[PDB]
Design a protein around this ligand. Structure first.
Ligand SMILES: Nc1ncnc2c1ncn2[C@@H]1O[C@H](COP(=O)(O)OP(=O)(O)O)[C@@H](O)[C@H]1O
Ligand SMILES: Nc1ncnc2c1ncn2[C@@H]1O[C@H](COP(=O)(O)OP(=O)(O)O)[C@@H](O)[C@H]1O
Ligand code: VO4
Ligand code: VO4
Ligand SMILES: [Mg+2]
Ligand SMILES: [Mg+2]
Length: 1170
């Protein structure tokens, strides 16, 4: 797959960032290059066997001075390490923030066309969360460490050039093997990272889709299906990670083996050179040490190379989206700002085909007139051309032919910000963001004070219900207003449209939930403030548009007639056809628990720990062999030094092969155990989340995008923390223990002193680990909040485009992201200071060791040879282990991630889905009853939506539940399919409490349809076959025929295979509701918890659907709710009043014959509207 070049990642750095990166590079270079020249100086005393050992008095003074020089080097390294760590971390944090802001701005600028063809909310959330973290890790202090290692290697090579050239020619000719291995490693890791990212992106979308529509998932029991799909979506990542781990082990082993063969050859040539006499001791010592340190540094920098590979792999995907230029805008040509705006929309021979289905022609030579100040109404069939006109007007899609005129010029030539402001669009189904009511209203005009908002709310008949809420204007509505009533949602959208005060009003299929009285109030408000402005009304019910001057019906291709009410009746046209159709229808200690959780694959962990320890041995063995080599060199051994050198080069060859084997084994087995653990924890976390009740979802921090981001982020660190920390910790402790034992072997008093210094280093590391942890937790929540904001913005692009609100989203993003920069500055400064202090403490320890050894030499025993061998071994081992401190921060940032993982698993649901023993009874009766049920929603537990009321539905009957003011129409449905718990009383379905019956059987025996159906992002056939899984295509076809859906479905090109899209877009409300009814009838439950169904079906299909529903409910119990008072002819148990309490139900015919009542007044008002 394609990958962005590494240098292209630095595309968001200003002058200040360039200076910081330059300072960091200089500091890293100095830190790397300090050591080789320092040991070049150190060689003068390393030659002590022939330099000044004759006079014992001068040895102690000389080595004390050299200890002071080593302390000076410690100060120099401490100062240098501070600069390169702090400057690089600050530069990385600044760049990623600008990248995130630019990416959000670029993705929020794309039109609706880009989102429907290849874009998903889950994909966007995952790209925001994970990829930006990888890019931040790519350009962080990892580059500093890589530059430090490279500078050390080059400095060692230059030092080798100075003393004796041939040795350094070998050390420079061995480069191509390491280069080729690194190239293969980078290429393979980039490929594997691309594949794994693709695999993970699909998994994240599936989980979030199931989480968002939790009510539909619970109603049509499908947690097993979602879990199986999620597990299958991450099947390939196991093999890809296995290959990546095998590649990592092979590269490091090959590098170390090449280094070992180079060391053996360089030792043999150095020996023969000393035999020649051209070289003398110290030069060979310096060259050998330089070569060893260079090979070690390359082996260390291999991991940073891999990190860079992954970073560039993610950076390609991030950069590809932002660089995508938007669709056509082309608006400023002549009419930049016309002051003669009056409406007068002209449509001339305009054709249109949607990008998803370009073959189907929606419009063919479409002509229509929208004169100024005239309330033009649009009516037609269920899905012909109604909402497409609004989409064309609101610059969503251009027409492939023809043009449309805003009374002075084609709309293609305008100003986009100017155009969208003059027209106020009302969505067919409003999409309220997750923000308080007042700010939702302020979406329209952000510069409106309280008085204007109050006036707008009062105009739209929304003051009453808003002021009755506990908080008032600050109550949250949650995701898409799921926790707010359907009727109250429409009032908020109307108020938001009114506050904008546009010159052209586009009333789409709104004003549907308002039963009779709110309808009259909003119509009075509309034709009292919108008089004198261009008006376009798209209404299904014919009574609302009775007082319309010109009713232009829209059918296939073009319009038919543009007459008034009475004029179209005379010819009977096609408008009067709808009228006569309507008339006849009416008649702590959790890390150990996490390791315990990985019990089944214990052999892999054991063998990996064996490999880690075994590679831990080889660290100090190099120093031991080098010390013995220099000892025999200074003896000059002109008897059997040939034998000594050949035996030791054989040792080197064996050690190289040994290291290859050990590294391969260790890395492969840790890779496999880490991937198994990550997959298992992901599966269990998703199962635990799906186990929770709906109330846990109805909160502020429990959002679909938030949960998806948390799942995507946490497990990843859970891998990276477990895989990396375990390897380095075991290796470093094993190497340190081996070096300490070796120090014990040659000396005892000196080594006790060095083991007396470990508390200082461990306390410094503990301080490091403590300091960074506290502020790391705060930033995680902020990043999750930003991801949630981005996902919420992307999910409602239709509302964002209509009401220009990109500035608000950017402002919220910046406000959320402001704090982490300020915290990161101090975090970087503290980390750099602590790293410098740790390095200074580490170096100061060795100087004291050398001084103590010198003092012992002055006193007698433990002479020159023993102390300096200890010094060299400690130097090598400390240099080898001086990587855990650098690796500590990025590992320790996942500590709070693990705590979040266990917090989700720990929580026990209040609603146990099965309980595994709770009366598995399948013989359902259907005689539901309520007894003194008192309920209050957990979100606002101060409203008491239900009073002491009781209602009974005998099996074989039906409910009407007229709900004029939203009190309990949809709340009773939540009781039967229990989502919450009644505070008092009890509810029974089969004569027994449903709290003790297992939910799986009950939810299998019962089925419902939502008031606002939300189709899954799949084909029509998959959506229909969601209920009663394992259904042949014949059954699906029969269900679609019975639901009056085979008509339009067969009209579609790809039969029952056309993709729908997220939330159920790229279709019509009528078609979506038909598909939902088809799924519900396919499930075929004993009790059909029906609800408001004749919402978007007010067309020529109304008679067919109602008859089919009546036939379906012949042997079923239904609770259908309907404020339309037209499709409730089933005269059983209407249930007139549900305002908190209940009122005597009787029957529909009874209350028709009974005197004035809530149903009677509703019918009177509807007939008056008629
Ligand atoms: N975003 C879209 N992508 C592809 N096809 C669409 C899209 N929106 C609407 N359509 C198609 O256009 C037709 C009419 O849709 P719509 O305007 O919603 O009808 P109505 O508004 O009368 O219900 C539908 O059959 C649907 O298949
Ligand atoms: N999930 C929820 N969280 C908080 N309040 C809710 C929730 N669902 C409904 N309500 C409140 O209960 C009242 C009645 O809602 P609802 O049952 O939808 O009425 P209807 O079904 O008659 O439209 C509303 O005013 C709403 O504020
Ligand atoms: O907002 V409702 O149509 O459930 O009364
Ligand atoms: O816009 V609709 O004709 O699916 O109510
Ligand atoms: Mg529509
Ligand atoms: Mg409702």
């Amino acid at each position: 797959e394609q990958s962005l070049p590494f240098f292209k990642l630095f595309s968001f750095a200003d002058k200040f960032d360039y200076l910081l990166m330059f300072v960091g590079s200089l500091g890293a270079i100095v830190h790397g290059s300090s050591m080789p020249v320092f040991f070049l100086l150190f060689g003068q005393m390393v030659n002590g066997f022939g330099k000044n050992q004759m006079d014992l008095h001068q040895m102690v003074h000389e080595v004390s001075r050299y200890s002071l020089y080593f302390v000076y080097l410690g100060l120099v390294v401490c100062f240098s390490s501070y600069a390169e760590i702090a400057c690089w971390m600050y530069s990385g944090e600044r760049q990623v923030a600008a990248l995130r802001k630019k990416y959000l701005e670029a993705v929020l600028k794309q039109d609706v066309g880009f989102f429907d063809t290849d874009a998903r909310t889950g994909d966007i959330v995952f790209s925001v969360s994970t990829d930006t973290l990888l890019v931040q890790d790519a350009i962080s202090e990892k580059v500093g460490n890589f530059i430090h290692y490279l500078s050390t290697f080059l400095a060692g090579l230059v030092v080798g050039f100075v003393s004796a050239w041939k040795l350094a020619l070998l050390s420079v000719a061995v480069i191509p093997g390491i280069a080729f291995a690194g190239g293969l490693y980078a290429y393979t890791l980039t490929g594997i990272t691309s594949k794994s990212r693709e695999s993970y992106a699909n998994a994240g979308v599936i989980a979030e889709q199931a989480i968002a529509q939790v009510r539909t998932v619970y109603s049509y029991v499908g947690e097993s299906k979602a879990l199986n799909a999620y597990s299958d979506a991450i099947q390939y990542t196991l093999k890809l990670g296995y290959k990546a781990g095998m590649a990592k082990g092979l590269g490091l082993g090959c590098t170390y083996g090449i280094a070992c063969m180079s060391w053996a050859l360089v030792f043999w040539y150095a020996g023969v050179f000393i035999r020649n006499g051209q070289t003398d001791g110290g030069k060979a010592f310096t060259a050998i040490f330089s070569a060893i340190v260079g090979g070690m540094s390359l082996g260390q920098s291999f991991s940073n190379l891999g990190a860079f590979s992954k970073g560039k792999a993610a950076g390609y995907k991030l950069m590809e989206i932002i660089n995508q230029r938007p669709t056509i805008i082309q608006d400023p040509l002549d009419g930049k700002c016309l002051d003669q705006v009056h409406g007068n929309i002209e449509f001339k021979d305009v054709t249109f085909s949607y990008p998803s289905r370009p073959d189907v022609m929606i419009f063919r030579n479409f002509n229509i007139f929208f004169p100024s100040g005239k309330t033009v109404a649009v009516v037609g069939g269920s899905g012909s051309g109604k909402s497409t006109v609004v989409s064309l007007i609101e610059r969503f899609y251009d027409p492939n032919s023809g043009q449309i005129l805003l009374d002075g010029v084609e709309i293609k030539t305008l100003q986009l910000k100017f155009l969208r402001e003059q027209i106020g669009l009302v969505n067919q189904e409003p999409a309220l963001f997750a923000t308080t009511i007042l700010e939702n209203i302020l979406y329209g005009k952000p510069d409106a004070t309280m008085v204007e908002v109050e006036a707008a709310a009062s105009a739209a008949n929304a003051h009453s219900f808003i002021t009755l809420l506990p908080k008032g204007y600050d109550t949250q509505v949650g995701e898409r207003g799921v926790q707010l009533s359907g009727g109250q949602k429409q009032r908020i959208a109307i108020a938001r449209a009114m506050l904008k005060d546009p010159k052209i009003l586009l009333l789409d299929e709104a004003t549907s939930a308002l039963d009779a009285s709110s309808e009259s109030i909003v119509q009075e408000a509309l034709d009292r403030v919108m008089v004198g402005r261009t008006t376009v009304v798209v209404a299904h019910r014919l009574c609302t548009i009775r007082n319309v001057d010109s009713i232009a019906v829209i059918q296939q291709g073009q319009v038919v007639e543009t007459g008034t009410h009475e004029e179209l009746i005379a010819k009977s046209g096609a408008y009067a056809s709808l009228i006569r159709f309507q008339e006849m229808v009416g008649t702590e200690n959790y890390f150990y628990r996490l390791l315990k959780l990985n019990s089944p694959e214990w052999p892999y962990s054991i063998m990996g720990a064996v490999g880690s320890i075994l590679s831990g041995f080889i660290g100090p063995t190099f120093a031991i062999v080098m010390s013995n080599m220099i000892e025999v060199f200074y003896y000059t051994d002109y008897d059997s030094m040939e034998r000594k050198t050949k035996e030791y080069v054989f040792i080197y060859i064996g050690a190289g092969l040994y290291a290859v084997g050990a590294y391969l084994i260790q890395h492969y087995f840790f890779s496999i155990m880490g991937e198994n653990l990550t997959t298992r924890v992901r599966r269990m976390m998703l199962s635990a989340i799906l186990r929770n009740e709906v109330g846990w979802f109805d909160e502020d921090e429990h959002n679909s995008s938030l949960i998806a981001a948390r799942l995507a982020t946490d497990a990843a660190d859970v891998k990276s923390a477990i895989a990396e920390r375990i390897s380095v910790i075991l290796q470093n402790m094993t190497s340190l223990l081996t070096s300490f034992i070796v120090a014990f072997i040659v000396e005892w008093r000196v080594s006790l002193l060095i083991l007396g210094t470990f508390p200082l280093l461990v306390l410094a590391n503990f301080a490091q680990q403590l300091s960074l942890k506290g502020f790391a937790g705060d930033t995680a929540k902020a990043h999750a909040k930003t991801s949630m904001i981005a996902g919420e913005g992307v999910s409602n692009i239709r509302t964002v485009a209509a009401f220009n609100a990109q500035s608000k989203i950017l402002s919220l993003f910046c406000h959320e992201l402001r704090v982490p920069q300020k915290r990161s500055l101090y975090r970087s400064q503290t980390s750099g200071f602590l790293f410098g202090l740790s390095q200074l403490a580490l170096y100061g320890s060795e100087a004291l060791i050398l001084w103590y050894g010198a003092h012992l030499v002055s006193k007698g025993v433990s002479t020159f040879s023993k102390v300096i061998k200890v010094f060299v071994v400690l130097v090598i081992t400390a240099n080898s282990v001086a990587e855990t401190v650098s690796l500590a921060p990025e590992i320790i940032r996942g500590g709070e991630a693990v705590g979040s993982v266990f917090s989700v698993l720990d929580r026990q649901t209040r609603i146990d889905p099965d309980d595994a023993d709770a009366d598995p009874v399948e013989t359902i009766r259907g005689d539901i009853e309520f007894r003194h049920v008192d309920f209050a929603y957990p979100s606002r537990p101060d409203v008491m939506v239900f009073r002491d009321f009781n209602l009974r539905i005998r099996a074989g009957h039906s409910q009407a539940l007229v709900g004029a003011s939203g009190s309990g129409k949809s709340s009773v449905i939540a009781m039967i399919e229990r989502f919450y718990d009644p505070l008092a009383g009890k509810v029974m379905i089969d004569g027994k409490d449903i709290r003790r019956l297992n939910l799986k059987s009950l939810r299998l025996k019962i089925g419902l349809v939502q008031q606002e159906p939300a189709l899954f992002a799949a084909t029509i056939f998959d959506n229909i076959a969601y209920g009663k899984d394992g259904a042949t295509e014949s059954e699906v076809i029969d269900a679609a025929r019975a639901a009056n859906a085979h008509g339009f479905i067969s009209g579609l090109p790809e039969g029952y295979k056309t993709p729908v899209g997220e939330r159920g877009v790229q279709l019509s409300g009528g078609q979506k509701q038909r598909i939902a009814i088809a799924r519900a009838v396919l499930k075929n439950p004993t009790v059909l918890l029906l609800d408001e169904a004749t919402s978007a079906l007010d067309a020529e299909s109304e008679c067919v659907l109602q008859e089919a529903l009546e036939r379906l409910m012949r042997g079923r119990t239904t609770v259908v709710v309907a404020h339309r008072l037209s499709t409730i002819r089933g005269v059983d148990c209407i249930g007139v009043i549900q305002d908190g309490r209940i009122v005597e139900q009787g029957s529909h015919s009874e209350l028709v014959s009974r005197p004035e009542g809530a149903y009677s007044r509703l019918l009177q008002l509807q007939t008056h509207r008629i």
